Design a protein around this ligand. Structure first.
Ligand code: HEM
Ligand SMILES: NC(=O)CCn1cnc2ccccc21
Length: 289
């Protein structure tokens, strides 16, 4: 099972920079969403959930096929709330119908990270929409009520190592949980990409509590929260060292996140030797827009 990247016919960097820009301008415009967080965080989560269905063993799932557009995956209980991201992207897809679904979903995540002042994420085009029967079954995305050993094992299926796992989890600086989506009660929320996930883990005074959906989560007096899988990163000694590294080196976190996130978004894709190089999109700010 091979998924070969195929450039949308006649398209080049500039074409995709126009899609980036349309996302980025809508992100700026539609600022009321989720008590003024805006859509950045949910777009990052979308890009991650369309990619995170991948299985290295048989190359099923992953971003390539754009299968989140199909009912089985759109209605996965793990994907509750991501409909908001899909709806945000709908006008963009209508404006630029030449782009594939998987390309759009993943570029939405890239755009959101960069526009939220995160690292540059190189991004490759050529994902090709696949039929409805290629949609992966529900249940391939991770549980939050688990420990470090569960997280480590789970991410082996995505070919991620300890450093890659700890780096990716830093996206949990963004946004918040919503009881109605996931059974977790959200805490202080932000829409700027920083290493604050690691700083909060190490510096806050955490208390284990049971929320109104009966689930355990870690809460701080300052109003922040951590999932049990987040907190696991300071329970396990291997994860803890990495957490400390990123809490103490913003640039290293940025560089490692960028690599991991691009890898996550490209898992399962075979890029021809003469495929275009990855694109690095300019932010609205870099363009003076
Ligand atoms: C063990 C792995 C992970 C678990 C169990 C997990 C679990 C969760 C849960 C339960 C939520 C709350 C959803 C809601 O209530 O709306 C959430 C939100 C979020 N997740 Fe994760 N996640 C994990 C990994 C990741 C990764 C790898 C990324 C991306 C790199 C990511 C990005 C986000 C974002 C940005 C949000 C905020 C969404 C919003 O504000 O709407 N997560 N996650
Ligand atoms: N320290 C925080 O409250 C950052 C927000 N946060 C912590 N864990 C999270 C998991 C998902 C979304 C946001 C999360």
């Amino acid at each position: 099972l091979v998924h070969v990247a195929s450039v949308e016919k006649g398209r080049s960097y500039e074409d995709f920079q126009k899609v980036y820009n349309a996302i980025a301008l809508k992100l700026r415009e539609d600022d009321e969403y989720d008590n003024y967080i805006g859509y950045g965080p949910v777009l990052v989560r979308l890009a991650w959930h369309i990619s995170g269905t991948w299985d290295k063993h048989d190359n099923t799932g992953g971003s390539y096929g754009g299968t989140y557009r199909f009912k089985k995956e759109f209605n996965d209980p793990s994907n509750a709330g991501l409909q908001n991201g899909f709806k945000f992207l709908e006008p963009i897809h209508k404006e630029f119908p030449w782009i594939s679904s998987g390309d759009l979903f993943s570029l939405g995540g890239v755009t959101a990270v960069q526009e939220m002042q995160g690292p540059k994420i190189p991004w490759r085009c050529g994902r090709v929409d696949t039929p409805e029967d290629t949609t992966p079954d529900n249940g391939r995305l991770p549980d939050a009520d688990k420990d470090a050993g569960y997280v480590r094992t789970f991410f082996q299926r995505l070919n991620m190592n300890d450093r890659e796992v700890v780096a990716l989890m830093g996206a949990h600086a963004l946004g918040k949980t919503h009881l109605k989506n996931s059974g977790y009660e959200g805490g202080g929320a932000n829409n700027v990409f920083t290493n604050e996930f690691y700083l909060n883990l190490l510096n806050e005074d955490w208390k284990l509590e049971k929320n109104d959906a009966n689930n355990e989560q870690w809460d701080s007096k300052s109003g922040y929260m951590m999932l049990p899988t987040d907190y696991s990163l300071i329970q396990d000694p291997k994860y803890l060292s990495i957490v400390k590294e990123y809490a103490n080196d913003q640039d290293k976190f940025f560089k490692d996140f960028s690599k991991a996130f691009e890898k996550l978004l490209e898992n399962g894709i075979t890029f021809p030797k003469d495929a275009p190089s990855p694109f690095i999109f300019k932010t609205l700010e870099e363009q003076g827009l």
